[PDB]
C-alpha cells in the first residue's frame, strides 16, 4: 500500500527475552507481547519485552488477557518506565519463519488498534552464532489492490529485504507480508561491560586462581597426557612415513585415496599448551 521507509529499532534486553522464552517452550509457538514507543512515521523503537502466559496444549493458539494487560502495565507504571505497546511476537521453531494462518488471523484483529504494530518472529533453532534471526513482518490489505502498493522510500531497505530470504512459500508470502529492516544500537557502557563479562569473566575470580591451577596441572596430570602424546607420535608416525612414499607411488597428487591423514598438528598444539603452561610455572610460583 502506501509505504514509508522501513526501519525497526531494538533494545538489547529484547533479543535475550525473545530467545529465552522462545527456547523454554520450543515445540509450541509461544505468544509474547512487545513494548516500546512509536517515535515517528518510519522508525519504531521497542524498549521492553514481557512474555505472555500459556494455555491449553496446542500449537500457535494465542490470547491477550486484558486483566494481565492492566496488571502488567500497572506494574510497569510503578516501574520506572511506563510506555505504549508496539506489537507482539512468537516463534516458528522448525522452519523458515513465515507467519501462519493463525498469525494473520490475530493480525487482522490486532491491526485495528494500531497501524504499525509490527509482528516479529524469533527463531532459536535456525540461528547458531552468526544469526539473530530477527525476522519481522507487516500485513497488507486486500481493499487496496485496485490501487498500487509501491512507493518504497529509501530503496536500499527492500533490496536488502530480498537477500535474507529463501523459500517457495516465502516467495508465495510476499503477498500479505512485506518485511521491515531491523538494526541494532548498543550502549558503549553496555557494550564495554558485556565485553567486561565476556572477555574478563570467562577468566575466573581473582584471575590468579585458574592459572595457578594450570600450574598444578603441569607437574601432576600433564605427564599422563604426555605419555598419550608420545604414544600417538610414535604410532601415527610409522605409518605416516608411508605417506610421501605412496605420494611418489600413485600419482602427482590425485584424489583422496583413503582414511587417515597426518593429524600431527593438533597433537603438537596440545604440546604447545604443555610448554606455555610450563612457562606459567616460573611466573606464578616465583613471586
Amino acid at each position: 500500500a502506501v509505504d514509508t521507509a522501513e526501519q525497526v529499532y531494538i533494545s538489547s534486553l529484547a533479543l535475550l527475552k525473545m530467545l529465552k522464552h522462545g527456547r523454554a517452550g520450543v515445540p509450541m509457538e509461544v505468544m509474547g507481547l512487545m513494548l516500546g514507543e512509536f517515535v515517528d512515521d518510519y522508525t519504531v523503537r521497542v524498549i521492553d519485552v514481557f512474555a505472555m502466559p500459556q494455555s491449553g496444549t496446542g500449537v500457535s493458539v494465542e490470547a491477550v488477557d486484558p486483566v494481565f494487560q492492566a496488571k502488567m502495565l500497572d506494574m510497569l507504571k510503578q516501574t520506572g518506565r511506563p510506555e505504549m505497546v508496539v506489537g507482539w511476537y512468537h516463534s516458528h521453531p522448525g522452519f523458515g519463519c513465515w507467519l501462519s494462518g493463525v498469525d494473520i488471523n490475530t493480525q487482522q484483529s490486532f491491526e485495528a488498534l494500531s497501524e504499525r504494530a509490527v509482528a516479529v518472529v524469533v527463531d532459536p533453532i535456525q540461528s547458531v552464532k552468526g544469526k539473530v534471526v530477527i525476522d519481522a513482518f507487516r500485513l497488507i490489505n486486500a481493499n487496496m489492490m485496485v490501487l498500487g502498493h509501491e512507493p518504497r522510500q529509501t530503496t536500499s531497505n527492500l533490496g536488502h529485504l530480498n537477500k535474507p530470504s529463501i523459500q517457495a512459500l516465502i516467495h508465495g508470502l510476499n503477498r500479505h507480508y512485506y518485511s521491515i529492516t531491523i538494526n541494532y544500537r548498543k550502549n558503549e557502557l553496555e557494550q564495554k561491560m558485556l565485553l567486561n563479562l565476556h572477555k574478563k569473566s570467562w577468566m575466573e575470580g581473582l584471575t590468579l586462581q585458574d592459572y595457578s591451577e594450570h600450574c598444578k596441572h603441569n607437574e601432576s596430570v600433564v605427564k599422563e597426557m604426555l605419555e598419550l602424546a608420545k604414544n600417538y607420535n610414535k604410532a601415527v608416525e610409522e605409518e605416516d612415513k608411508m605417506t610421501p612414499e605412496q605420494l611418489a607411488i600413485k600419482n602427482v597428487g590425485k584424489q583422496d585415496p583413503k582414511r587417515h591423514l597426518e593429524e600431527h598438528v593438533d597433537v603438537l598444539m596440545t604440546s604447545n599448551i604443555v610448554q606455555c603452561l610450563a612457562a606459567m610455572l616460573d611466573t606464578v610460583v616465583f613471586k
Binding site: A24, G25, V26, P27, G56, G58, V59, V61
Partner: protein
C-alpha cells in the same frame, strides 16, 4: 450446558495429530534419535519438562 460442552468441542477442534514412534537411543543431552513406525529414522529434540 449444550453451549458449554459444544464450546469445549469448539476449542478442541484445533488439536493436531502427533506421530507415534520409538526411541532408538540417546545421542547427547538434547539430541535424540528415534524411529518412525511407518518408515524412516529421525534425529529429534525434547521438551524442557520431560
Amino acid at each position: 450446558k449444550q453451549y458449554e460442552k459444544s464450546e469445549n468441542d469448539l476449542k478442541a477442534l484445533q488439536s493436531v495429530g502427533q506421530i507415534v514412534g520409538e526411541v532408538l537411543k540417546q545421542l547427547t543431552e538434547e539430541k535424540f534419535i528415534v524411529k518412525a513406525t511407518n518408515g524412516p529414522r529421525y534425529v529429534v529434540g525434547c521438551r524442557r519438562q520431560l
